[PDB]
Scaffold this motif. Structure first.
Motif, PDB file in Angstrom:
ATOM      1  N   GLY A  20     -19.291  27.952 -16.812  1.00 11.98           N
ATOM      2  CA  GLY A  20     -19.640  29.400 -16.971  1.00 11.98           C
ATOM      3  C   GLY A  20     -20.127  29.708 -18.401  1.00 11.98           C
ATOM      4  N   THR A  21     -20.256  28.684 -19.214  1.00 12.27           N
ATOM      5  CA  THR A  21     -20.700  28.906 -20.619  1.00 12.27           C
ATOM      6  C   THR A  21     -21.425  27.672 -21.141  1.00 12.27           C
ATOM      7  OG1 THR A  21     -18.409  28.492 -20.877  1.00 12.27           O
ATOM      8  CG2 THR A  21     -19.087  30.646 -21.494  1.00 12.27           C
ATOM      9  N   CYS A  22     -22.276  27.891 -22.102  1.00 10.80           N
ATOM     10  CA  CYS A  22     -23.029  26.756 -22.714  1.00 10.80           C
ATOM     11  C   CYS A  22     -22.622  26.625 -24.204  1.00 10.80           C
ATOM     12  CB  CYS A  22     -24.532  27.055 -22.615  1.00 10.80           C
ATOM     13  SG  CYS A  22     -25.586  25.737 -21.967  1.00 10.80           S
ATOM     14  N   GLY A  24     -22.583  27.149 -27.587  1.00 14.00           N
ATOM     15  CA  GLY A  24     -23.343  28.071 -28.475  1.00 14.00           C
ATOM     16  C   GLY A  24     -23.511  27.453 -29.864  1.00 14.00           C
ATOM     17  N   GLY A  25     -24.577  26.723 -30.041  1.00 10.43           N
ATOM     18  CA  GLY A  25     -24.809  26.084 -31.368  1.00 10.43           C
ATOM     19  C   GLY A  25     -25.616  24.794 -31.212  1.00 10.43           C
ATOM     20  N   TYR A  26     -25.769  24.348 -29.995  1.00 12.22           N
ATOM     21  CA  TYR A  26     -26.540  23.111 -29.765  1.00 12.22           C
ATOM     22  C   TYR A  26     -28.024  23.417 -29.733  1.00 12.22           C
ATOM     23  CZ  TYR A  26     -22.800  19.857 -29.047  1.00 12.22           C
ATOM     24  OH  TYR A  26     -21.739  18.998 -29.253  1.00 12.22           O
ATOM     25  N   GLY A  27     -28.329  24.659 -29.525  1.00 11.47           N
ATOM     26  CA  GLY A  27     -29.754  25.062 -29.474  1.00 11.47           C
ATOM     27  C   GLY A  27     -29.974  26.157 -28.429  1.00 11.47           C
ATOM     28  N   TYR A  28     -29.028  26.331 -27.532  1.00 13.79           N
ATOM     29  CA  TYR A  28     -29.220  27.366 -26.505  1.00 13.79           C
ATOM     30  C   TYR A  28     -28.970  28.753 -27.028  1.00 13.79           C
ATOM     31  CZ  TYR A  28     -28.481  23.487 -23.147  1.00 13.79           C
ATOM     32  OH  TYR A  28     -28.558  22.324 -22.416  1.00 13.79           O
ATOM     33  N   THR A  29     -29.378  29.647 -26.213  1.00 11.24           N
ATOM     34  CA  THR A  29     -29.181  31.083 -26.445  1.00 11.24           C
ATOM     35  C   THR A  29     -29.393  31.745 -25.105  1.00 11.24           C
ATOM     36  OG1 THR A  29     -31.445  30.987 -27.032  1.00 11.24           O
ATOM     37  CG2 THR A  29     -29.979  31.089 -28.852  1.00 11.24           C
ATOM     38  N   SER A  30     -30.450  31.308 -24.497  1.00 14.13           N
ATOM     39  CA  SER A  30     -30.846  31.839 -23.155  1.00 14.13           C
ATOM     40  C   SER A  30     -30.382  30.889 -22.054  1.00 14.13           C
ATOM     41  CB  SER A  30     -32.367  31.971 -23.102  1.00 14.13           C
ATOM     42  OG  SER A  30     -32.839  30.660 -23.374  1.00 14.13           O
ATOM     43  N   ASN A  31     -29.629  31.376 -21.108  1.00 15.73           N
ATOM     44  CA  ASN A  31     -29.210  30.490 -20.029  1.00 15.73           C
ATOM     45  C   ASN A  31     -29.045  31.224 -18.709  1.00 15.73           C
ATOM     46  OD1 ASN A  31     -27.316  32.008 -21.409  1.00 15.73           O
ATOM     47  ND2 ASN A  31     -26.568  30.252 -22.450  1.00 15.73           N
ATOM     48  N   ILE A  38     -23.908  25.597 -13.908  1.00 12.51           N
ATOM     49  CA  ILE A  38     -24.900  26.387 -14.682  1.00 12.51           C
ATOM     50  C   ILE A  38     -26.058  25.519 -15.096  1.00 12.51           C
ATOM     51  CG2 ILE A  38     -23.206  25.876 -16.543  1.00 12.51           C
ATOM     52  CD1 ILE A  38     -24.799  28.017 -18.189  1.00 12.51           C
ATOM     53  N   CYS A  39     -27.251  26.097 -15.184  1.00 13.46           N
ATOM     54  CA  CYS A  39     -28.335  25.346 -15.874  1.00 13.46           C
ATOM     55  C   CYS A  39     -28.733  26.184 -17.103  1.00 13.46           C
ATOM     56  CB  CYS A  39     -29.573  25.001 -15.022  1.00 13.46           C
ATOM     57  SG  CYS A  39     -29.374  24.432 -13.331  1.00 13.46           S
ATOM     58  N   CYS A  40     -28.906  25.531 -18.204  1.00 15.72           N
ATOM     59  CA  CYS A  40     -29.088  26.268 -19.486  1.00 15.72           C
ATOM     60  C   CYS A  40     -30.550  26.227 -20.025  1.00 15.72           C
ATOM     61  CB  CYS A  40     -28.146  25.587 -20.454  1.00 15.72           C
ATOM     62  SG  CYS A  40     -27.429  26.546 -21.802  1.00 15.72           S
ATOM     63  N   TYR A  41     -30.978  27.361 -20.548  1.00 17.35           N
ATOM     64  CA  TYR A  41     -32.349  27.500 -21.165  1.00 17.35           C
ATOM     65  C   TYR A  41     -32.133  27.597 -22.699  1.00 17.35           C
ATOM     66  CZ  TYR A  41     -35.652  27.756 -17.397  1.00 17.35           C
ATOM     67  OH  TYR A  41     -36.515  27.418 -16.376  1.00 17.35           O
ATOM     68  N   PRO A  42     -33.178  27.664 -23.556  1.00 14.48           N
ATOM     69  CA  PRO A  42     -34.642  27.778 -23.227  1.00 14.48           C
ATOM     70  C   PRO A  42     -35.245  26.685 -22.390  1.00 14.48           C
ATOM     71  CG  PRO A  42     -34.260  27.740 -25.693  1.00 14.48           C
ATOM     72  CD  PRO A  42     -32.901  27.646 -25.004  1.00 14.48           C
ATOM     73  N   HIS A  43     -35.077  25.498 -22.825  1.00 11.03           N
ATOM     74  CA  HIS A  43     -35.798  24.397 -22.188  1.00 11.03           C
ATOM     75  C   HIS A  43     -37.293  24.564 -22.441  1.00 11.03           C
ATOM     76  CE1 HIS A  43     -37.915  25.747 -18.521  1.00 11.03           C
ATOM     77  NE2 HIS A  43     -38.733  24.773 -18.931  1.00 11.03           N
TER      78      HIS A  43
END
Length: 43
Positions: A20-22, A24-31, A38-43
């Motif tokens: 339910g969470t990605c 926060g600091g690896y590069g994501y922001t948008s998911n 879950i699948c996480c963006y930006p991508h």
């Protein structure tokens, strides 16, 4: 990561699990989230 497409965004999303969470600091922001995973963006 997964070529999982998401809602509103074609292309792909990184497939994450029932988190339910990605990280926060690896590069994501948008998911996008589709429990129980879950699948996480930006991508």
């Amino acid at each position: 990561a997964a070529p999982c497409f998401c809602s509103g965004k074609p292309g792909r999303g990184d497939l994450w699990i029932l988190r339910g969470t990605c990280p926060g600091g690896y590069g994501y922001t948008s998911n996008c989230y589709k429990w129980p995973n879950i699948c996480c963006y930006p991508h």
